[PDB]
Amino acid sequence: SKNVVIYADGVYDMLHLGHMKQLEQAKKLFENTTLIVGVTSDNETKLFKGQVVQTLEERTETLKHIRWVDEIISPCPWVVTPEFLEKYKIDYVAHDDIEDIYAWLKRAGKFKATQRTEGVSTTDLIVRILKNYEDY
Amino acid sequence: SKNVVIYADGVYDMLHLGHMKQLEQAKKLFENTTLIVGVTSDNETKLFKGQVVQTLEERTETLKHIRWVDEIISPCPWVVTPEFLEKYKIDYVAHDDIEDIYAWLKRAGKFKATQRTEGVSTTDLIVRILKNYEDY
Description:
Chain A is an alpha/beta fold. The first copy, chain A, is built from 6 helices and 5 strands, in the order E-H-E-H-H-E-H-E-H-E-H.
């Protein structure tokens, strides 16, 4: 089939199985895709979202090693725009939306949902380490 | 060129950039390779090596997502043997050796060194998180 350009953005701090399953899902939305992943800058993540432990450079170097990732934009825009989609020939934005800042994307037919996997996160694994030390 | 079968084994607990750079190095030892990765069982890792936080199933599911990994043997033998190399048509074992349990591999011309990257580990990132809380 024809090659579909998919865009997915995120913070990707301390990459874990949860991000990877999401990336894999974005990549397989169609039989032939190019998955572009956008990695948010440090400043704007902290300003708008929350604490980041890894720098942009580290967050991006880890993503380079994931099988599903075809291209990375680093840093990426914090807000996706129609001009951005035209410039990089993006057919679909892959998100999990979790008023609606993505309504124009749905109206344009350019939105494809992916999902999160709970309980697989890096912070969760440290919780598991700590359970081995009894409170008493 | 001809296709070279490379074998690398390890625990791969809480996969981080350090493992990935090593896998990438094993994969690029030659122009055309098949990288087989062996993941050690829970029992034998704990018995011979140390604590593991993720099960075999989790440690293996994460490796499935890495670009360099062509095949996984899970669980893998704890000790590599010549019969193992013959069975899976392995040309080289990729290790970082860090008396010598791998001397027969070097004698057979079947040993290729890779290296570790320090300071990139998942436990290190939690140390970074904690630096934000001042002791006083």
